[PDB]
Amino acid sequence: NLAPLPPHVPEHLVFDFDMYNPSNLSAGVQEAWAVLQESNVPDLVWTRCNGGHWIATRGQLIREAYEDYRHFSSECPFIPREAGEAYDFIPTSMDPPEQRQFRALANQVVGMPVVDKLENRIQELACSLIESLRPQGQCNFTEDYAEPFPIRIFMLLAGLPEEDIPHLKYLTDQMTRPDGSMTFAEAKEALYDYLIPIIEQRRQKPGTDAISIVANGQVNGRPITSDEAKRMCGLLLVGGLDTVVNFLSFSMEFLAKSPEHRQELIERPERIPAACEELLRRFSLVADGRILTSDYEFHGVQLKKGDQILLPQMLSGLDERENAAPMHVDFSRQKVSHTTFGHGSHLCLGQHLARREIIVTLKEWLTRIPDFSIAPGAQIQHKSGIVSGVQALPLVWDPATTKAV
Ligand code: HEM
Numbered sequence: 001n002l003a004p005l006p007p008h009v010p011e012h013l014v015f016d017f018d019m020y021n022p023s024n025l026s027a028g029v030q031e032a033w034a035v036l037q038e039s040n041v042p043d044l045v046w047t048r049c050n051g052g053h054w055i056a057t058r059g060q061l062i063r064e065a066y067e068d069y070r071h072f073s074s075e076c077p078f079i080p081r082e083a084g085e086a087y088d089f090i091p092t093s094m095d096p097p098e099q100r101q102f103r104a105l106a107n108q109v110v111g112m113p114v115v116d117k118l119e120n121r122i123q124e125l126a127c128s129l130i131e132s133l134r135p136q137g138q139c140n141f142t143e144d145y146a147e148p149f150p151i152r153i154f155m156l157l158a159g160l161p162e163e164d165i166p167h168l169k170y171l172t173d174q175m176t177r178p179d180g181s182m183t184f185a186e187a188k189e190a191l192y193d194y195l196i197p198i199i200e201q202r203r204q205k206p207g208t209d210a211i212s213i214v215a216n217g218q219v220n221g222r223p224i225t226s227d228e229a230k231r232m233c234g235l236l237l238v239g240g241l242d243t244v245v246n247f248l249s250f251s252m253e254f255l256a257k258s259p260e261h262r263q264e265l266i267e268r269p270e271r272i273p274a275a276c277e278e279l280l281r282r283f284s285l286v287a288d289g290r291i292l293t294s295d296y297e298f299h300g301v302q303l304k305k306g307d308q309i310l311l312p313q314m315l316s317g318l319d320e321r322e323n324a325a326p327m328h329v330d331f332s333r334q335k336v337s338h339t340t341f342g343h344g345s346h347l348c349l350g351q352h353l354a355r356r357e358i359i360v361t362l363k364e365w366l367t368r369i370p371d372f373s374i375a376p377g378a379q380i381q382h383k384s385g386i387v388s389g390v391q392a393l394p395l396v397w398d399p400a401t402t403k404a405v
Pocket residue numbers: 074077090091092093099103106110235236237239240241243244247285286288289313340341342343345346347348349350351353354
């Protein structure tokens with residue numbers, strides 16, 4: 001279903017891309033989005049799908065719009081508009097200058113120094129998960145490794161009890177994998193209902209966990225409100241889940257399908273940090289955006305106040321103008337350019353945690369289970385949206401080729 005073309009949008013810019021069900025999906029989600037980068041497609045296009053919105057298709061424009069928060073606001077950062085409007089997480093629904101100090105506070109609980117303290121739990125968790133699967137000679141990687149992993153790391157950061165995991169997973173899945181039974185707003189409130197009491201408790205009796213630190217923080221000259229803390233904690237919980245789960249799945253799918261790339265990292269483990277970066281570029285997966293604060297001419301195109309613009313983080317590193325031969329995976333690639341973690345004032349705060357999660361996973365998997373394949377006759381299904389992903393990833397291996405610890 002195609003929204004009526006707004007009068008200000010010229011015919012020549014119309015390309016009806018559907019970000020939730022793109023045409024070429026069965027052939028790979030990144031490939032399906034890359035159709036926007038074929039030579040007959042303008043740098044900035046309008047789709048009439050999903051309510052109607054702009055799409056910047058090239059890294060240059062994606063980066064530029066992410067820098068220009070004055071014109072391109074995060075107040076409504078998702079398509080469809082109804083989701084974007086309901087969304088009130090902090091700092092992702094806020095613009096500078098206000099956003100700056102909330103971002104500083106979030107950085108205390110997920111930034112660099114915290115990463116080093118977590119490293120042992122990250123490595124322990126990775127090992128225990130992998131050892132549980134290793135002698136079975138099969139798993140659904142997405143379900144059996146990827147899903148349990150980041151939620152467990154978050155519980156440790158946030159000092160939440162282990163027994164809360166299935167309920168919290170239920171709540172977060174309800175929000176980020178909607179089936180249409182709840183509005184976005186309803187799902188968000190259900191999540192908030194879990195967080196509200198905990199915030200109340202930790203403002204009275206704080207600990208040193210992430211929730212206590214956020215909930216008792218100072219921002220922009222005063223103490224954080226209970227409401228603001230709730231909106232921050234919502235993001236800190238969800239930000240690291242689907243992104244990491246789906247990114248690990250894209251990476252493991254590629255490695256199962258490429259024995260030569262596996263063998264490379266097996267023979268040359270020092271290359272894993274570089275491989276992580278090239279995989280972040282090739283299997284980039286996020287696509288959010290902004291709303292126009294005013295009428296604005298951007299690269300020769302008239303944009304109208306309140307227009308939504310999708311600025312897909314995924315596309316920058318797939319752009320052949322940024323990386324030559326963009327679909328080819330090359331662990332030796334020289335200037336790996338991407339915006340996988342975003343760009344501008346909202347550049348992912350979790351990027352350092354995410355890289356450790358990725359690198360630890362790859363290192364520990366390849367040393368215990370070096371040889372593995374997609375289950376024969378399985379066709380891997382991708383999903384597309386704000387966080388694109390893998391529906392299931394059935395892998396098999398001969399346990400005789402594996403290394404117990
Ligand atoms: C592969 C994994 C990840 C990817 C690809 C990713 C991607 C992104 C992107 C694209 C943004 C910017 C969104 C925008 O500009 O509207 C973002 C922001 C953010 N991410 Fe991540 N992320 C990942 C993992 C994580 C993790 C593990 C955490 C830890 C909680 C996290 C926490 C956040 C936070 C708090 C922000 C908001 C920063 C701000 O608004 O100032 N992310 N991320």
